[PDB]
Amino acid sequence: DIQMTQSPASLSASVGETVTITCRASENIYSYLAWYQQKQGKSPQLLVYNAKTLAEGVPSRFSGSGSGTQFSLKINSLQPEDFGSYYCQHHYGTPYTFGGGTKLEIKRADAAPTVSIFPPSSEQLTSGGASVVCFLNNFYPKDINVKWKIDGSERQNGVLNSWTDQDSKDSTYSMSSTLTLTKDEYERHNSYTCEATHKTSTSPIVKSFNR
Amino acid sequence: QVQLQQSDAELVKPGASVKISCKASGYIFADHAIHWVKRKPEQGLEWIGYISPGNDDIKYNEKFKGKATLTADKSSSTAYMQLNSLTSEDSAVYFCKRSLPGTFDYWGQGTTLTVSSAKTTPPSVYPLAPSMVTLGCLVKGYFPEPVTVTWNSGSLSSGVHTFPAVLQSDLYTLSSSVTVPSSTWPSETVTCNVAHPASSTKVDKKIVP
């Protein structure tokens, strides 16, 4: 029953840099340490076993090192596709415990969101619902604010937001904001407005339609 | 040729039991232990146990002793994990995986276990129609996870974002955007493909002006 301590919990670094992730065991585990990559929706991919041995297909810029209680994963020449979560796991004996993971973000230039707003489809209106959708696509960094307005006046009830993972090629974030209404509430107002504030501009980026 | 087949989704009422199957093919079943790993949002990865079918060796993480029960049908080369007395805490992705880290390391797709009184519902798929043009699909009122979205059967994947699902009123809502040049749309067809494994449904929605 060996405690495995991973650091850092989270990490931002640029394309081309070397990241160093640490795993420390509470007892000697000799060489029996593995590293896994996980991206959301995907099976863990083995990078390294026996502290230093690369799994088939893993780029050579990945290298594991260490023995006893002190282990390291280095990613040399960090690439946009290297974003995600990294876990150590010992294979010394049961229980085969995992470290807490490291989330690796790729730092990159600032980028302003491309904003688009969509009215409820006619299909959804005939079912008695109304969802107004705003996409805020391809922005960096992650921090953004979305304000809905109905007939010029702010609305915060009925709003659901979700963010993508970092994009594997351009290292940007996207975000979706849905304002969910009844058909009846939607038809009592005309102007629907999505307002994004990002650090890439002082004034908010504004997209709107009018039924 | 190596494969570990897992169902995408299990939905089970609180306090009930579930038996998650891991069907191995492409190799002799008895040659490798099958390990079980739990992936829960913000709880990283957690090793549950292994069953080594060759020698009937079964080992459990102490946390999962009463919780988890591992078995194998050698004849159909299938490993089983049974979770007992399910709670919302047990909702997670459960992977089966072969061997220890090494040359034989291989992972199933993962089974999304949702512990809930709510019943499986297929999604409604709604078109989002507006240099570059952005289109989308709104996938509304499905249960349980997961859903996969593609655009033009996968042949359109540059500038596709799929947003993680949000739970509202015990139903999931998810959106997907695709960005194409104004020349391609609407002269060329753009269609989102929504697969909901739990309900055995695929919906194709063609985005029309």
Partner: peptide, 7 residues
């Protein structure tokens, strides 16, 4: 050795 696992 005898069998993979311990270790």
């Amino acid at each position: 050795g005898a069998s993979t696992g311990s270790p």
